[PDB]
Design a protein around this ligand. Structure first.
Ligand SMILES: C[C@@]1(C(=O)Nc2cncc3ccccc23)CNS(=O)(=O)c2ccc(Cl)cc21
Ligand SMILES: C[C@@]1(C(=O)Nc2cncc3ccccc23)CNS(=O)(=O)c2ccc(Cl)cc21
Ligand SMILES: [Cl-]
Lengths: 302, 305
């Protein structure tokens, strides 16, 4: 029993974190085999940077890379989108089995927050529909990474680049493509209006049922179209037939049809919780995917 | 900016997790140097759990009855002893991945990270607090026994908890790494129940200071309170008594934000009376009590917004 916001074990990622320094800027890098990946902004310049022009002026020896108490030697450098790839003379002996994957809004991942190449904490989060993440990052956290683990393989999906004025965060995949309409420069940028991840709220309601919290269940059902009229009114993301199919296993385990759980969610949106909580929360939680619920209620290991 | 329930990076603890098997029971063990620590109930059957005589069950075992697996390698047990509710299995190999560590016994209100494991394999990491009733609200399925709680301030891992049991309300009980249970619990299937739980007042105050540091002040008021009047009100909402030690501990957060501890106590009294009125504090519609004053200082910026 119990249901916690749970992150993947971070050890495989901790063994890849390094410190990258270029002039006066210090941030984090990801060392995989003989390449260190980091935000290209490590190189007033932020007001209107020409990254190729700034990069051409740097030599390999300008980049200082520290792995623990050992200085790595940079022997090459190149830019791929908003990520800088620093070729080093030593392959990381702790390189795990890995892939670079781009995630979609609604998908969750663990973040290993680092400062000066040293991991400080691990937390779970979701890529919001507005492509930001509600992280916890201070100055020096740039280059910290997000990931999932599938079997023994780490799938790196996020690298931290920026904090927006509302205190939310923006970054790229490991190929340097930003999530969202963001750019790596100091200009007027803002998080768009966000919405609630409907399929994740439904998954969390199934998790509450599995754990014995059933007060919100009712005898009613709804059509997918009528539910989506309700979802649009409360700034909830539209629920698709794909989402219904994905929730199939949780529906079979609890005996509650997906559209029957949608009718419970409709009543919670229109009437509130009435002084009650679900899994110790007074808000409808949307940062657990259907897969996260199945994994935490089955004990999958890595 | 931001404020998350953050766990310590788990790598140093992952390298210590092993699987311990005794007959038909399989659970997790913590391998530090040449000793594997695990719950002594690994030697019990389900029938033994009503009234186990651990001394009598243990004397019938030899070293070769304990199977310890570390990854894909079988470790050889060369000795065994019981210390309180923990079994210590001496093995013929010192863990090459043993971090710098200490065994520390914590007090209610303290937080720690839990690395949940099954079959000696880590599955997830989450942040917990030792409740005032000495239980933890964990997430543990069958096979999670032996999973550990820890803090990693600096390069040293301080192990503070080992999982033993799930109570009828779905909350969890365990021991320190010397095998002493937290709370009035026994590693026996007896009528055991979590006592009435209360809210960790000093932690709610720390989290209100975290909200002020991150730029939110809507909940503040023009009032102050005496410590005694605060305690008389807070106990009516099942909040733990606030002591002078708690007031002293909140001193640094009080100096950083410019809000006196008893002035923040007045704000908490008003929040308990009014609720949030559709508002949230650090993205929560409830008063959060699983962040200590030390956690807030560690996570938050040193410059108030
Ligand atoms: C590097 C920087 C940034 O966001 N840093 C931070 C990133 N994360 C958390 C933080 C917390 C507190 C201060 C800074 C933080 C600097 N600010 S900026 O507007 O010039 C900008 C603009 C674009 C990009 Cl891609 C990065 C940045
Ligand atoms: C080992 C056991 C226990 O609590 N197992 C579990 C421990 N943690 C989480 C779980 C979840 C789902 C089922 C079981 C769980 C067995 N039950 S018992 O009442 O006989 C008992 C009594 C005392 C002690 Cl120290 C352990 C146990
Ligand atoms: Cl303590």
């Amino acid at each position: 029993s119990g249901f916690r916001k749970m992150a993947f074990p971070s050890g495989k990622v901790e063994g890849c974190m390094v410190q990258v320094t270029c002039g006066t800027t210090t941030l984090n890098g990801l060392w995989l085999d003989d390449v260190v990946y980091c935000p290209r902004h490590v190189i007033e310049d932020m007001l209107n940077p020409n990254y190729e022009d700034l990069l051409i002026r740097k030599s390999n020896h300008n980049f200082l890379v520290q792995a623990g108490n050992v200085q790595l030697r940079v022997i090459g450098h190149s830019m791929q989108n908003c990520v800088l790839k620093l070729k080093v003379d030593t392959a990381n002996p702790k390189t795990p089995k890995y892939k670079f994957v781009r995630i979609q809004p609604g998908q969750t991942f663990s973040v290993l927050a680092c400062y000066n190449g040293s991991p400080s904490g691990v937390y779970q989060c979701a890529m919001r529909p507005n492509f930001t993440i509600k992280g916890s990052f201070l100055n020096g956290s740039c280059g910290s990474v997000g990931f999932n683990i599938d079997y023994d393989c780490v799938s790196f999906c996020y690298m931290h680049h920026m904090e927006l004025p509302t205190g939310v965060h923006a970054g790229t995949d490991l190929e340097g493509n930003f999530y969202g309409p963001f750019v790596d420069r100091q200009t007027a940028q803002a998080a768009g209006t966000d919405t609630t991840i409907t399929v994740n709220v439904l998954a969390w309601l199934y998790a509450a049922v599995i754990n014995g919290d059933r007060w919100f269940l009712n005898r009613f059902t709804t059509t997918l179209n009528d539910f989506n009229l309700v979802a649009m009114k409360y700034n909830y993301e539209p629920l698709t037939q794909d989402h219904v199919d994905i929730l199939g296993p949780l529906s079979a385990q609890t005996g509650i049809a997906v559209l029957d759980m949608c009718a419970s969610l409709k009543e919670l949106l229109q009437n509130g919780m009435n002084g009650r909580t679900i899994l110790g929360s007074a808000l409808l939680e949307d940062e657990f995917t259907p897969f996260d619920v199945v994994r935490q209620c089955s004990g999958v290991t890595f």
